[PDB]
A paper describes a structure:
The nucleosome is the fundamental organizational unit of chromatin and comprises two copies each of histones H2A, H2B, H3, and H4 wrapped by ∼147 base pairs (bp) of DNA. The nucleosome contains a conserved cluster of negatively charged residues in histones H2A and H2B, known as the nucleosome acidic patch, that is a hotspot for interactions with proteins that regulate transcription, the cell cycle, and the DNA damage response. Monoubiquitination of histones H2B-K120 (H2BK120ub) and H2A-K119 (H2AK119ub) play opposing roles in transcription regulation and chromatin compaction. Our results suggest a mechanism by which H2BK120ub serves as a gatekeeper to the acidic patch and point to distinct roles for histone H2AK119 and H2BK120 ubiquitination in regulating protein binding to nucleosomes.
To see whether ubiquitin conjugated to H2A-K119 adopts discrete positions, we determined cryoEM structures of the nucleosome core particle containing ubiquitinated histone H2A-K119 and Widom 601 DNA (147 bp). The cryoEM dataset revealed two distinct ubiquitin positions, denoted H2Aub positions 1 and 2, with global resolution estimates for the corresponding EM maps of 3.41 and 3.47 Å, respectively. Similar to the maps for H2BK120ub nucleosome, the local resolution of the H2AK119ub nucleosome core, at ∼3 Å, was higher than for the conjugated ubiquitin, at ∼6 Å. However, the map resolution was sufficient to unambiguously orient ubiquitin within the EM maps. The ubiquitin in H2Aub position 2 sits at the nucleosome dyad bound to the nucleosomal DNA terminus, end-on, with the ubiquitin beta-sheet oriented towards the DNA. While the resolution is not sufficient to discern side chains, the ubiquitin position is consistent with van der Waals interactions between the hydrophobic patch on the ubiquitin beta sheet and the terminal base pair of the wrapping DNA. This ubiquitin position would be incompatible with a nucleosome embedded within a longer DNA duplex. We note that our attempts to determine the structure of an H2AK119ub nucleosome containing an additional 19 bp of flanking linker DNA (185 bp), which would be expected to prevent association of ubiquitin with the DNA end, were unsuccessful due to aggregation of the particles on cryoEM grids. The KD of RCC1 for nucleosomes containing H2AK119ub was measured by SPR to be 540 ± 90 nM, similar to the KD of RCC1 for unmodified nucleosomes. These results indicate that ubiquitin conjugated to H2AK119 does not interfere with RCC1 binding to the nucleosome, consistent with our cryoEM data showing that ubiquitin in H2AK119ub nucleosomes only partly occludes the nucleosome acidic patch.
Residue numbers in the entry:
A (entry chain H): 29 to 121
B (entry chain F): 25 to 102
C (entry chain E): 39 to 135
D (entry chain K): 1 to 73
E (entry chain G): 14 to 118
F (entry chain C): 16 to 118
G (entry chain D): 28 to 122
H (entry chain B): 20 to 102
Write the structure that this text describes.
DNA sequence: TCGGATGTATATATCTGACACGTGCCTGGAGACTAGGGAGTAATCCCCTTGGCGGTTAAAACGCGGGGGACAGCGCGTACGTGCGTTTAAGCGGTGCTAGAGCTGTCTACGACCAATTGAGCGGCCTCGGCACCGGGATTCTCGA
DNA sequence: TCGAGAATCCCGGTGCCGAGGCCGCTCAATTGGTCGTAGACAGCTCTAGCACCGCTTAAACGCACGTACGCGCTGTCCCCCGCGTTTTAACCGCCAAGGGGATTACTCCCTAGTCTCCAGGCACGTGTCAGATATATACATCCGA
């Protein structure tokens, strides 16, 4: 049956960054595993913190603090800047 | 301020481990190591209490920050 | 009279291994903690129990590190600890890069 | 009559002596057969120290005795 | 448009992340801004990794990326080594280093 | 009740409620809390028995955390289980390396 | 006047059952509270992860048994398994 | 069917090559045997986990994905085989 | 008859083996060892190829890391050749049993 | 200190199988609407933290004599690196086969929700003897002989 | 060995506060019942894991030979260690002030849930050119002079 993956999106990001480069299947599996692991870590930590503060729902602030706790400084602030930019762009329209 | 960790205190701490003949600049080395460790744990606790929307650091924040680093502590309700 | 070097050290080792109380004075540690936390946020208040927990954690960590340092020092056919032993132990532990 | 002497290295030395053998004589014997200068030796038998002008029998030293020496430096 | 991903101008899917978060049993009720934030973070990290890997492959005059390039890109960046200090990747290899006094005089 | 039906000491309803409210699964079985309570009771009974024996050795009638530390560190399976946890006011096992001792 | 629940009474009952004449200090009680909570959280998390990994939405006694067999070392694992199955059989025998 | 004397299959030159990857220059005579023990213990852990997973799935074939789970439990996550 | 000085071919092999990426241990002996080990826990088990491949990769990585730490300890101990005591010291410091 | 020899980086043809791309179709995602419960907001209490003063005494700081430890130079003999011929089992490659993994239908017992009820567990009070502190003597090492 | 000087453990008396117990109360666990579906069971098909045999050759094994390194011995120089005197600030006890952590009541609007529609992404299929293989050459480097 169907087997979900992260193919088209990673390929699109690669095309956006480097216009004339290609990658093999093993690198594809490695990137898929890396994305899944990062997703699992961030989501688990955010949910844990949300129940830690006795709150019954998860919101953008929880993920912001999870990113601040997980990633070290410089790329953490880069990622939070990207996230805020995306959030305001989405809510504007 | 960091000087406040007195040399005889370091000597006692090492004597608990079981060292015999202390020598050199292990005092300065220990001070640096302690500073780094405190910096990390304090940053984690401060982030926790920042999200909590409070102005007083509580024991739960410190216990939980120690829990994150795989250094679980027993005996403070955590 | 006078004692030969190396006996009072052993007596202190036994005495401190038998007991269970802290060895760092409370007030300088509290001042250091407040000064360190001053940078990250201004006008912060600390409960006493948090400072106590931090003190205990620091004591345990330092004791373990000194254990490993002693092991390395006796390994190279010496008796005195020097900083290179601390660096080696920290590097093998996986803490330092 | 023969005596055994115990050192700090765990080696026992067997020496033939007589009760008239003064401490000068026995110390000379140790120096001759072991090469140790006389000034480096202290002798204890039955827990007592000795004065060089005496003789062996003055400390009631019998045969087959065990006398301990200490190196002084 | 219609898709939520185009609304935020992102490439990673928003609806898929929302569905995974809802069905992953993390909280009883999930917010509405969380998927956008998470997708943006994932996109940024993937872009960084891919750019570093592409540069590493460029240095070796090969137009295709193999796992060795990913290993070199990850291990040659200090922070990225920090983030993945307990992760191994197949066929990666090891960095070419030698101790000092081991070398001939 | 339900603890009486199984001859347990730890509560069963409390464990059931914590499992249900702990967002672990959509639904829970009717046998899991009993098993979990039995395991918890066994572990705590082992720890307490060891700590009490250690306190008996020192000729005291009340358990203080040092007795718990000694009981945990002396056993080897229990030490393996609690490998990355520190106990407040615990102490250190009294060992000394062979070389350091005088001749 | 918050109703903070704990495990003090049950630990005291177990201690009295095992050792008749022995008392316990408050710090030891807090230590036992923390230890029990940590072990409970570990076992529940592992069992839930396994159940979700096998794409089944119901957590039963078998998942708990497997999690116990995973986390604890040999001797304690076998003893806990025996105690658990004995308790389950005793509970299901009656009604 | 019973199998035996497989530990000796790890040949000495292969161990020498593995050491040479890590950056070693000289090799003592007595190291090899020692190493042949350590590796064994490693395997004796991870397989013990993997089989248990196959026990819970009610199967008879050990899958690589179970090995990935077992390696993940010990905090040595591995990338390249899914999950 | 040319004869290279000791340590030169060793260095050349060092560079060669750090350059490449393929695995080192052969296939059939490893597969037989894995089957023999798994026989004890439960009889009549069947293995997938990718499982054996992953086990081999993990084992090689772990062994290489251990050897690197052993070399670090040996060079610290003012020697050039590694000895088993260095291996057990590295294992002890890492926290393994 | 050179010079012969050897390993290595580079230049070049080439053929293949893995990668990039077009197609059809199926299911999960988007649009419009409801409703109700969780979260933000305002006001009040009183509890724990901050701040400071006095004193006392224990610990900290400083200086000195010396001996035991760290480190460098030297000799040795033994264990390991390198080369070569012989022996051996890993690896490639086609063939048979079936046990067992994976998907499909069924129906059934097991668990979620809900109304009524009552007693198990928690907050508050009080009481005492096990443990902390102090004075005293027997015991056991430890350095100079 | 050994004997005297301290350091330590064992013994006995005294006082005080934390633990064990008792009492009163409130909300969560029990009981009885209905209704829906997660999964156990039985079956069917199709793949890949096991066993097999033959041929090739690259890899492993055993043996000589030589030399560089681990190890023990020795000598020197100096850096902490034990001890006594002067200096200081930690801690205990006490008192004042007040900020904000914790509750309680009220209001609103944000997300789960419903249905209907349709287009994004999946397996399938196919063509082709980037890299591995094999070959040939010039450059860098190493050990005897």
């Amino acid at each position: 049956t169907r087997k979900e993956s992260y193919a088209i999106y990673v390929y699109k990001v690669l095309k956006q960054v480097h216009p004339d480069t290609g990658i093999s299947s093993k690198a594809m599996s490695i990137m898929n595993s890396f994305v899944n692991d990062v997703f699992e870590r961030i989501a688990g930590e955010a949910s844990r913190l949300a129940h830690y503060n006795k709150r019954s729902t998860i919101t953008s602030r929880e993920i912001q603090t999870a990113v601040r706790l997980l990633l070290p400084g410089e790329l953490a602030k880069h990622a939070v800047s990207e996230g805020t930019k995306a959030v305001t762009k989405y809510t504007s329209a | 301020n960091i000087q406040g960790i007195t040399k005889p205190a370091i000597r006692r701490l090492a004597r608990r481990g079981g060292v015999k003949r202390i020598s050199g600049l292990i005092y300065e080395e220990t001070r640096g190591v302690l500073k780094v460790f405190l910096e990390n744990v304090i940053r984690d606790a401060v982030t926790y209490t920042e999200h909590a929307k409070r102005k007083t650091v509580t024991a739960m924040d410190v216990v939980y920050a120690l829990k994150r680093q795989g250094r679980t502590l027993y005996g403070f309700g955590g | 009279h006078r004692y030969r070097p190396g006996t009072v050290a052993l007596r202190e080792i036994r005495r401190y291994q038998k007991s269970t109380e802290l060895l760092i004075r409370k007030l300088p540690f509290q001042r250091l903690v407040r000064e360190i936390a001053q940078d990250f946020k201004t006008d912060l208040r600390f409960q006493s129990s948090a400072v106590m927990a931090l003190q205990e954690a620091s004591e345990a960590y330092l004791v373990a590190l000194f254990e490993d340092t002693n092991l390395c020092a006796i390994h190279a056919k010496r008796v005195t600890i020097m900083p290179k032993d601390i660096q080696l132990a920290r590097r093998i532990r996986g803490e330092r890069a | 009559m023969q005596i055994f002497v115990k050192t700090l290295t765990g080696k026992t030395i067997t020496l033939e002596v007589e009760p008239s053998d003064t401490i000068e004589n026995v110390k000379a014997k140790i120096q001759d057969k072991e090469g140790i200068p006389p000034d480096q030796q202290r002798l204890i038998f039955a827990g007592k120290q000795l004065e060089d002008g005496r003789t062996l029998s003055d400390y009631n030293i019998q045969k087959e005795s065990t006398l301990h020496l200490v190196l002084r430096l | 448009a219609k898709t939520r991903s185009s609304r935020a101008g992102l490439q990673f899917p928003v609806g898929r992340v929302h569905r995974l978060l809802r069905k992953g049993n993390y909280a009883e009720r999930v917010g509405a801004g969380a998927p956008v934030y998470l997708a943006a973070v994932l996109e940024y990290l993937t872009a960084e990794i891919l750019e570093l890997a592409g540069n590493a492959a460029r240095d070796n005059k090969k137009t295709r990326i193999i796992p060795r390039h990913l290993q070199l890109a990850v291990r040659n960046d200090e922070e990225l080594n920090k983030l993945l200090g307990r992760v191994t990747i197949a066929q990666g290899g090891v960095l070419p280093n030698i101790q000092s006094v081991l070398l001939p005089k």
